[PDB]
Amino acid sequence: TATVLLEVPFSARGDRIPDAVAELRTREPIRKVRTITGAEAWLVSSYALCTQVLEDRRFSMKETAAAGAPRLNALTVPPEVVNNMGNIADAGLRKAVMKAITPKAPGLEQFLRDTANSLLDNLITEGAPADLRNDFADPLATALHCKVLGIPQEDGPKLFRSLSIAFMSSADPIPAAKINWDRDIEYMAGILENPNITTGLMGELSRLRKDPAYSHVSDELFATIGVTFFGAGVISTGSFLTTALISLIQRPQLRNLLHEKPELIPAGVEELLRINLSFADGLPRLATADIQVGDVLVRKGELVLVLLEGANFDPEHFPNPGSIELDRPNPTSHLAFGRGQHFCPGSALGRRHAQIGIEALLKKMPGVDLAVPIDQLVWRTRFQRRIPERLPVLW
Ligand code: HEM
Ligand SMILES: c1ccc2c(CCc3ccnc(N4CCOCC4)n3)c[nH]c2c1
Ligand SMILES: [Cl-]
Ligand SMILES: [Cl-]
Ligand SMILES: [Cl-]
Ligand SMILES: [Cl-]
Ligand SMILES: [Cl-]
Ligand SMILES: [Cl-]
Numbered sequence: 569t570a571t572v573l574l575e576v577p578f579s580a581r582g583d584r585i586p587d588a589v590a591e592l593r594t595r596e597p598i599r600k601v602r603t604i605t606g607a608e609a610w611l612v613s614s615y616a617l618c619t620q621v622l623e624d625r626r627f628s629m630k631e632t633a634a635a636g637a638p639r640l641n642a643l644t645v646p647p648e649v650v651n652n653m654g655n656i657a658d659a660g661l662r663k664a665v666m667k668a669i670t671p672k673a674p675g676l677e678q679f680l681r682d683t684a685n686s687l688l689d690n691l692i693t694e695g696a697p698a699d700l701r702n703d704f705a706d707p708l709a710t711a712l713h714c715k716v717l718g719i720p721q722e723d724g725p726k727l728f729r730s731l732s733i734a735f736m737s738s739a740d741p742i743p744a745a746k747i748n749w750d751r752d753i754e755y756m757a758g759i760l761e762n763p764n765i766t767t768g769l770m771g772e773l774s775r776l777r778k779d780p781a782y783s784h785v786s787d788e789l790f791a792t793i794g795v796t797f798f799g800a801g802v803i804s805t806g807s808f809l810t811t812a813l814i815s816l817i818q819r820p821q822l823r824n825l826l827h828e829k830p831e832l833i834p835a836g837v838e839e840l841l842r843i844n845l846s847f848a849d850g851l852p853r854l855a856t857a858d859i860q861v862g863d864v865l866v867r868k869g870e871l872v873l874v875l876l877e878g879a880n881f882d883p884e885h886f887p888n889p890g891s892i893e894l895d896r897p898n899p900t901s902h903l904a905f906g907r908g909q910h911f912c913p914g915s916a917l918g919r920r921h922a923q924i925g926i927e928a929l930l931k932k933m934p935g936v937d938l939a940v941p942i943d944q945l946v947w948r949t950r951f952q953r954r955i956p957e958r959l960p961v962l963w
Pocket of ligand 3: 585586587588
């Protein structure tokens with residue numbers, strides 16, 4: 569009979585990869601698909617072709633925002649913000665931004681440990697079941713990013729509550745996204761004017777804003793950096809830690825190994841990154857030339873989607889890809905943080921947030937287990953991350 573063009577995304581479930589990804593990678597590692605907008609796109613699912621796309625800048629991030637392009641989903645930010653990191657570099661701020669978002673600031677890791685332990689103590693006081701997303705992973709991400717930005721902890725929750733809309737993956741524009749964006753930009757602009765904000769990313773930007781070497785950088789860009797790095801960081805670390813906790817909980821042996829030998833936690837977190845399904849969609853790129861990718865000549869103006877778990881579960885690159893193995897010879901060679909020009913600038917911070925969160929959880933809750941059958945988790949739909957709405961656990 570007549571069937572329709574394969575639709576993406578395949579599944580919003582973040583606890584398991586569909587058997588179909590490996591079939592696709594074997595048969596057609598670059599394949600035409602239809603996005604939620606009705607646009608056509610090329611879905612790339614092997615490690616070799618994913619790397620190729622990500623390392624060829626003729627597959628452009630910023631051109632995805634062009635009027636009239638085939639879209640994966642609607643913009644939730646102004647179109648110039650799709651080029652955020654390019655704009656930051658053009659302003660001469662890349663080195664300073666990247667320095668402020670490392671985990672190296674004195675006291676930062678101790679703050680993370682302290683926060684995690686306090687969050688966990690409060691759950692233990694309250695009694696099982698506990699929700700490890702809403703009452704551990706996300707608050708820990710939110711607290712971390714207020715500290716990194718230099719802004720009050722008490723301002724965290726409001727900025728955070730924009731994110732269930734900001735990171736939607738929608739066929740159509742979202743009126744609430746503009747409402748929240750304008751509000752959060754105004755908040756950050758106020759932060760730059762606030763004399764009490766002297767530390768973290770916003771303290772440093774606020775100084776640079778008054779330094780004559782940056783007098784022609786726009787105020788809008790300074791506020792944009794705060795909103796976008798808070799939102800990207802919080803959504804990415806909170807969502808990654810949440811689904812890494814599921815993967816750990818599902819593996820009691822690994823849980824007990826990391827609990828007994830916490831010096832292995834970094835290698836375990838690197839494998840959890842490798843197998844992580846937090847990104848709900850392929851990474852989008854627009855071709856700016858005709859480019860051969862595998863068996864397909866991608867044409868100028870076409871949309872390409874780089875499926876991270878396609879690369880990261882590719883057995884040609886990671887043998888026994890579904891197994892967490894702490895002694896792989898190529899352990900950071902995954903694509904969890906992307907690759908190339910747009911490699912995640914928060915990568916070290918994201919690693920440390922997950923390592924510290926996991927270390928603290930295994931110490932406080934060595935008997936942690938799901939308090940519901942895994943199929944009872946509710947997976948968020950039409951979102952840029954795969955997130956269970958609640959993560960009920962007992963210990
Ligand atoms: C485990 C945590 C994280 C994961 C898995 C993650 C993942 C990624 C990925 C895959 C990309 C590449 C997107 C692409 O090429 O289209 C990216 C880029 C980006 N990430 Fe992260 N991220 C994480 C944490 C962070 C943090 C903590 C921040 C900031 C505080 C951050 C800020 C950004 C920004 C601003 C970009 C865009 C870079 C560019 O366009 O050059 N991420 N992230
Ligand atoms: C309302 C509307 C949008 C937001 C955001 C940002 C959402 C978003 C979407 C897509 N890309 C990106 N980034 C591109 C790369 O640089 C990092 C940021 N950021 C935070 N809070 C909001 C409130
Ligand atoms: Cl399946
Ligand atoms: Cl345009
Ligand atoms: Cl919602
Ligand atoms: Cl200049
Ligand atoms: Cl070529
Ligand atoms: Cl390979």
